Homo-oligomer: 114 residues x 3
Amino acid sequence: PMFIVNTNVPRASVPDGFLSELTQQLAQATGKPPQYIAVHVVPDQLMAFGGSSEPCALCSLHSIGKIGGAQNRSYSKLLCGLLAERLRISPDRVYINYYDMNAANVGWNNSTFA
Amino acid sequence: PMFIVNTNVPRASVPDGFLSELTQQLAQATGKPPQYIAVHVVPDQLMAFGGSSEPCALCSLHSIGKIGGAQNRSYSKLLCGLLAERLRISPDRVYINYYDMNAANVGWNNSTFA
Amino acid sequence: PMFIVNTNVPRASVPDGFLSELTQQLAQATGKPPQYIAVHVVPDQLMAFGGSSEPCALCSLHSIGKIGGAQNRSYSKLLCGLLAERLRISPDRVYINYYDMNAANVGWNNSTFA
Ligand SMILES: O=c1c(O)c(-c2cc(O)c(O)c(O)c2)oc2cc(O)cc(O)c12
Ligand SMILES: O=c1c(O)c(-c2cc(O)c(O)c(O)c2)oc2cc(O)cc(O)c12
Ligand SMILES: [Cl-]
Ligand SMILES: [Cl-]
Ligand SMILES: [Cl-]
Ligand SMILES: [Cl-]
Ligand SMILES: [Cl-]
Ligand SMILES: [Cl-]
Ligand SMILES: [Cl-]
Ligand SMILES: [Cl-]
């Protein structure tokens, strides 16, 4: 599984262990193998949310299954909570796009998961 | 909605107020309140379009609805026009991927829009 | 088509001609004219794969058609081989997400491919 967060928050404001904390919390939330969670944080971005350059975040979570109405609601509370706690981003300035991927459309280790 | 533009154009060539112009033009085009519009500009990128490193842009527009055949044609004229006018990117070196998102797959403010 | 690779590998470790080799190999693999191939390489990223910050890559290939079970398996072997040979990234630390785009959802040159 793969989680990307793009933010205008400066790199110095990303705390130590942020990638590690994301890895564990997403592995637990998705039930996917922790050793297989990919996380990508992109700070210092030129972005605006509602025309304002106050701290904001645009995110995506791609997973083969474990995507749905209730599960995405739980992911959003979890992820917004982390961005608020660690990056001081208000949850109403966070978008997270969820993608339920077909196994044939995720490549890894010279093949796909299909 | 969320609009991202990645370009090899240098940051200095992105004019001041470009994020706001994108926000206002997208709010009017999509009919969405500008408060709902997130914009992200990534300049100075290592990119090629058709093997050439002339100014180019790879973009994406995600929106819950307001995506379709005629609308995307209109968005593409609008967005290529802005990138041509403000970033001096030729429209034939611009790609824009459009995504009609399900409300259940867009996270915001600790929940989803579903 | 559009190919993006995000990696924590430093920019200095991206060899000359990497964008060109990706364009040529993707044109041949997808059967699309290289002229239609856009490539985007993002080095020096803050990323982890399984909690580890050893070299890894997160990639995406968007194409109008030429996406499917067998083709994506062939794409993944091809691309992982290139990232292993050129960027020294182990294939088991590479994710590639594949997207079959509808022509109506790809904007280019003030219109779409529909
Ligand atoms: O990321 C992975 C993944 O998602 C699961 C998976 C794939 C499917 O196609 C499913 O239907 C499913 O329930 C789980 O397999 C894996 C097996 C590995 O050894 C390593 C992985 O990283 C995955
Ligand atoms: O970005 C948003 C959005 O797209 C619309 C919306 C959602 C739907 O599910 C629709 O069907 C629709 O027509 C509009 O609601 C919102 C409400 C907010 O308070 C804030 C938002 O940012 C959105
Ligand atoms: Cl669910
Ligand atoms: Cl898919
Ligand atoms: Cl939206
Ligand atoms: Cl969706
Ligand atoms: Cl294409
Ligand atoms: Cl050379
Ligand atoms: Cl196929
Ligand atoms: Cl599509």
